[PDB]
Amino acid sequence: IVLAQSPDSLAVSPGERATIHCKSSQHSIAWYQQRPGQPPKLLLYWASMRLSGVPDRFSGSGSGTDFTLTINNLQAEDVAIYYCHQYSSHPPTFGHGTRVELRRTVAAPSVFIFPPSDEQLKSGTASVVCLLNNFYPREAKVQWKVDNALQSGNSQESVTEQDSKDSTYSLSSTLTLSKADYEKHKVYACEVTHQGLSSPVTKSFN
Amino acid sequence: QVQLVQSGGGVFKPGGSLRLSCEASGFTFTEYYMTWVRQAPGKGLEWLAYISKNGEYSKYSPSSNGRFTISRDNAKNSVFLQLDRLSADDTAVYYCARADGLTYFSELLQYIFDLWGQGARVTVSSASTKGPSVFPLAPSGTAALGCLVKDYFPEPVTVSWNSGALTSGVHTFPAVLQSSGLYSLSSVVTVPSSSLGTQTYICNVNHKPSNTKVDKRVEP
Amino acid sequence: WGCSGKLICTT
């Protein structure tokens, strides 16, 4: 008994309507809200019955196998992950959730490149950092190249929560090499692709 | 006020065991089956266990294999979760949750989790406490500079800039667990290029678990 | 049959 929940992510403007789906392989459905760094909170059970205190803009529906959570007049406090829960199966299961983010105009990342400090090289490792600042939507990709040679499996990424101020995201890519591998190379560059870009941006150094 | 307050989280060596606690107030405790639910970093919710009203009957997820024990102390309005033979896969946030549902004899049925504790963070690593190393990310319109906070254990560190006097356009990233078993993140901030040689930028890194604070001046 | 709480039972 699985719960395919969709979409995985969902961008919505404030005042507008958010629509989350939940389908099972086989009305005992509950919906939960979890804001960043917060515990889950029950909103609806029996698919359509709101818990006391939950605002009227939250409504649930669902015929048999497909279930819907609807958020009208979207508020800022509504940005969270939403989980559907089937409680008539054994054991009970949850969907993997649906992220509800705010919608804004497309923004291109201001890309910066950061050479490893001389202070770090003394330790024996070299961290090259690429920064993608204040962009939208969240989807973006970053390629590392050293002497024009593509790198992979040696760079960790990390991205911020949606910005409270301007609804943008930021991303960091950290390329880690040994001191040996860093001193035997010259030109370092990260290449960024994104919707707000008409062509892949490159920042580099020697 | 109707609430569940948890405690007992922390960092643990593998192979051992831990007990988590949850204290209920504002409602009649013996009228509810209590449960534990956990959430692994990134993953979803996983129901672990439920315990009956009188604290005598408990049921577990099929994947528990006896490692988990839920228990309760009604005189203290408390539920507990013990977890033996800890491994890294046990690293997660653990929630205490109240269950509303049907019972059939001792079996809990048709249940929803209508009240939740604030959660307890559990980290299991063979790693030892280590303060962070802090390396500058030196800058070249507007400029960008930052701090690389590397090789610390455990989480968290907090980063502030200029003793917390600089907040505008600061972005501190989520920590990532390196293969070495240590954590690492960056904190960047974008400022006017003109104020580079007129304003000094120091990032401040606080690491409570090791009782340390590191300041790093950042210049081009 | 019995109840844990009341929501599920009384709906």
Residue numbers in the entry:
A (entry chain L): 2 to 27, 31 to 210
B (entry chain H): 1 to 52, 52A, 53 to 72, 72A, 72B, 72C, 73 to 100, 100A, ...
C (entry chain P): 596 to 606
Quoted from the paper:
7B2 IgG1 mAb recognizes a linear epitope in the gp41 immunodominant region with cross-clade reactivity (clades A, B, C, D, CRF1 and CRF2) as measured by peptide microarray. MAb 7B2 IgG1_AAA and similar gp41 antibodies capture a subset of infectious virions in a CD4–dependent manner, mediate ADCC, and neutralize BaL in macrophage cultures. MAb 7B2 IgG1_AAA most likely recognizes gp41 stumps from which gp120 has been shed or some other non-native form of envelope on the virion. The data in this report demonstrate an exposed gp41 structure at amino acids 596–606 of Env that is exposed both on gp41 on HIV-1 virions and on virus-infected cells. This is the first structure of an antibody complex that shows binding at the functionally important disulfide bond in the chain reversal region of a retroviral entry protein.
The most prominent finding in the structure occurred in the central segment of the epitope-bearing peptide where a closed loop was displayed by virtue of the disulfide bond between Cys598 and Cys604. The cyclical conformation of the gp41 peptide was fostered by Gly600, where any side chain would diminish the backbone's ability to adopt the closed conformation and would clash with the side chain of Tyr32 in CDR-H1. The immunodominant loop as seen in the BG505 SOSIP.664 structure resembled neither the conformation in the 7B2 complex structure nor the NMR solution peptide structures. Thus, the immunodominant loop is inaccessible on pre-fusion spikes though it is present on Env stumps, so 7B2 and antibodies like it may capture virus and bind to virus-infected cells but fail to neutralize because they bind stumps and post-fusion structures.
